[PDB]
Amino acid sequence: VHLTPEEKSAVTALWGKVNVDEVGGEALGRLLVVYPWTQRFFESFGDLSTPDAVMGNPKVKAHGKKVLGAFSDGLAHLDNLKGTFATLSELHCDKLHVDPENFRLLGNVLVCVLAHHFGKEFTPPVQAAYQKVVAGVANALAHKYH
Amino acid sequence: VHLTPEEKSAVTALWGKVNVDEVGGEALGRLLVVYPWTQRFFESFGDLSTPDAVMGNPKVKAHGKKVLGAFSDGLAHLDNLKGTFATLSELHCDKLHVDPENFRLLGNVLVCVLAHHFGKEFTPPVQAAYQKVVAGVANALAHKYH
Amino acid sequence: MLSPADKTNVKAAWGKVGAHAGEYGAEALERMFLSFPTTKTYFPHFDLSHGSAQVKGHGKKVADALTNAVAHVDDMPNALSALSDLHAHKLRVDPVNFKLLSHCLLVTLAAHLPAEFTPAVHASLDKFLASVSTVLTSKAR
Amino acid sequence: MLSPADKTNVKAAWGKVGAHAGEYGAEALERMFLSFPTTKTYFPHFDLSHGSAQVKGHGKKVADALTNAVAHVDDMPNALSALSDLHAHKLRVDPVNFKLLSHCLLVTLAAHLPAEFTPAVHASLDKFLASVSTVLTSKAR
Ligand code: HEM
Ligand code: HEM
Ligand code: HEM
Ligand code: HEM
């Protein structure tokens, strides 16, 4: 993206404090709860009938951890996201058939989760840096669609 | 942009048949009519009260020609829309305060006008190429916003 | 909110589509798949090749529903309740895609109804497809 | 549409905002200006500096309007008619910008209501801001 050095440091500093397992589960769960249409891809996950059903679903939690793991890796290759995410992009398109707009929704949910978790530490400018990051990842993930 | 030589020829060839004067006046007028909030930037033009009043407004027509002229000149630089529109990007930002979302609206209006004009000739594949160009131009124009 | 003039304009334009609605339904989809390749994510089970019978058939289906909405321009919510349900609870299409199809339908109409696709009619049809979109995405959550 | 549940959720979280609405309104604007710079094109007449009184003042107005929407959760179209008219005819804000402020309002709330910002409340708040945005943009054309 367009990350100033000080934006890159701000991202990295905060990311250091994140429990990826936990934030992953929280972001994926909230996605399925706020934009229920996104549940379309997880019919094998079981009970997604209520908020508690979603948030506590062991399958949602595990998938969340998988997704945020892949995301954390992306954070180390902020220079080459498209490269980093190319095989995942191809997979989401050709095998999973996941509309890329889902990637932007997840990005927004993650920002809300980071705000939820960090409170005041998630300053206006720290958010502006993350906004750029989630956009970049979403773009990277959509790059191989055809 | 990410135009294939084939998509390139398609654009280029259709364009050579365009009457910039008429297409520009119609694209701009249709914009003011379909999305009335765009009229906020043209208070000084006069009567925009009715479709008929917009479509007839000479100030509208002449602005349409100037806009399509610049657009037309950009098609000669498809490999660097960013550098071609850098100064215009800053102007739209810094002097005109035009929301870049308008660039997108105009692009779609332009595609509707070309289809209207070329009927049969404006095939799905020719449209796909134009869609890439309008998106590319809007992106370049919004590029220096801060 | 469609004005009396809008409903008029829509009824007029659609009146001319007539026996070609199905063909236009089909061409709009074709234009969509080509221009906005992400929309294909919802049709993995279809043959998306040019002139595919699946696309043709679906084009018809979309057209007929638009026809039914024109006939009930006054009672859209009610006329398309079943379709709103299907899309909301079964298909689960992301709302952004409705804007893409709408634009492709406009383009298609422009290309085929030269005389009728005036600035006023363009505005009304845009508003119309927007209202149809709203109805189809209203029970999404 | 907002369910009874949504309504309870919204009154509850907004309840908690209380006397901080103004400050949170201001903060949401600031976050929006920094993340989505294009939104600044509507405020060329403002000092957009950190702690600008204009932003502070503007933040209070926005918060008061939301507070008013919560107060009339069963009659928002009417409770907000005036503001809808203003946005439609004077301000002429492009619709997409509403989604941007809504998102930033959500971020702000999240950042200040750790205990109340549950998944369920997040979902209700999102739907609420979407409803308010719909009203403010209903007469746009
Ligand atoms: C930050 C964006 C995302 C990243 C980095 C990501 C990453 C991953 C990874 C690493 C996998 C496992 C790949 C494999 O099975 O070989 C996966 C699978 C999957 N992802 Fe994504 N994902 C993201 C967003 C999304 C979103 C937003 C959705 C849908 C709403 C989604 C839907 C799926 C599905 C359905 C699977 C397969 C699940 C299964 O095992 O059945 N992903 N993703
Ligand atoms: C394809 C996209 C566009 C291009 C290439 C373009 C280009 C231009 C050019 C070449 C000028 C001449 C002014 C100068 O050089 O001093 C101009 C002015 C202007 N444009 Fe854009 N424009 C585009 C889209 C838009 C849109 C969509 C709007 C608003 C809806 C807009 C609003 C204006 C205004 C208000 C002016 C100043 C006119 C005046 O001085 O009276 N432009 N534009
Ligand atoms: C103008 C808005 C739309 C209208 C009026 C419309 C109408 C319809 C109709 C009439 C059907 C057939 C229902 C049946 O089989 O009984 C249908 C199915 C379907 N629609 Fe929608 N549609 C619209 C927008 C969309 C969009 C934007 C998408 C995705 C990008 C979409 C995806 C689907 C899919 C995947 C099916 C099922 C196709 C099949 O499996 O045969 N629709 N739609
Ligand atoms: C749902 C969210 C919104 C609410 C509740 C809201 C509410 C208001 C209110 C109460 C006012 C003051 C009216 C008065 O002077 O009495 C106002 C003005 C204004 N709003 Fe909105 N608004 C919203 C969204 C937006 C957005 C998204 C934008 C642009 C990005 C915007 C741009 C403006 C502008 C430019 C003014 C005039 C400010 C001034 O010059 O003092 N509004 N809004």
H or E segment and range at residue A14: helix A5-15
- Residue C46: count of CB within 10 angstroms of its CB: 16
Q: Which residues contact C115 (CB under 8 A, 6 or more apart)?
A: none
Give, for ligand 4, the residue of D60, D61, D64, D94 to mutate: max count of ligand atoms closer than 8 Å to Cβ. D61
Q: How far is CA A92 from the centre of its chain?
A: 14
Chain C residue whose CA is closest to A102: C94
Output phi, psi for C78, to 5 deg.
-80, -45
* Spatial distance between the Cα atoms of C80 and C73, rounded to a whole number of angstroms: 10
DSSP assignment of B50-103 equals SHHHHHH-HHHHHHHHHHHHHHHHHTT-TT-HHHHSHHHHHHHHHTT---THHH
Please answer whether residues D13 and B122 qualify as being in contact, where contact means their C-beta atoms are separated by less than 8 angstroms. no
* Spatial distance between the Cα atoms of D72 and D82, rounded to a whole number of angstroms: 14
Q: What does the H/E/C string look like for C10-22?
A: HHHHHHHHHHHHH
Closest CA to C106 of C46, C31, C34, C6: C31
CA distance readout (Å), D105 to A36, A133, C103, D111, D134: 21, 20, 30, 10, 16
Q: Is B1 known as a binding-site position?
A: yes
CA distance readout (Å), C85 to A81, B57, C133, D137: 38, 45, 13, 25
* Spatial distance between the Cα atoms of D135 and D73, rounded to a whole number of angstroms: 12
* Spatial distance between the Cα atoms of B128 and B140, rounded to a whole number of angstroms: 19
Q: Degrees (nearest 5) of the Cα angle B3, B7, B13?
A: 125
Helices (H), A16-96: 20-34, 51-56, 58-74, 81-91
Question: B100 and D44: CB-CB below 8 Å?
Answer: no
Give, for ligand 3, the residue of C31, C38, C42, C126 to mutate: max count of ligand atoms closer than 8 Å to Cβ. C42
Q: Is D87 known as a binding-site position?
A: yes
* Spatial distance between the Cα atoms of D3 and D9, rounded to a whole number of angstroms: 10
For D22, the 3-state DSSP assignment is: helix
**Domains of chain B, earliest start first:** 1-146 (1.10.490.10)
* Spatial distance between the Cα atoms of D119 and D121, rounded to a whole number of angstroms: 6
Q: How far is CA D91 from the centre of its chain?
A: 16
* Spatial distance between the Cα atoms of B135 and B137, rounded to a whole number of angstroms: 6
Q: What does the H/E/C string look like for B4-65?
A: CHHHHHHHHHHHCCCCHHHHHHHHHHHHHHHCHHHHHHCHHHCCCCCHHHHHHCHHHHHHHH
Burial group, residue C15, by CB count within 10 angstroms (0-12, 13-18, 19+): exposed
Please answer whether residues A85 and A143 qualify as being in contact, where contact means their C-beta atoms are separated by less than 8 angstroms. yes
Is there an interface between C and D (3+ Cβ pairs < 8 A)?
Answer: yes
**Domains of chain C, earliest start first:** 1-141 (1.10.490.10)
A99 and chain C in contact, CB less than 8 A: yes
State the Rg of chain B over Cα: 15
Task: Say how many CA atoms lie within 13 Å of A109 toward its Cβ.
Answer: 28
State the Rg of chain A over Cα: 15
Ligand that comes closest to the CA of residue A65: 1
Note the maximum CA span of chain C: 41
For A19, the 3-state DSSP assignment is: coil
Burial group, residue D32, by CB count within 10 angstroms (0-12, 13-18, 19+): buried
Please tell me the experimental approach by which this structure was elucidated: X-ray
Structure tokens at B6: 């084939």
Question: C111 and B120: CB-CB below 8 Å?
Answer: yes
Q: Which residues contact B91 (CB under 8 A, 6 or more apart)?
A: none
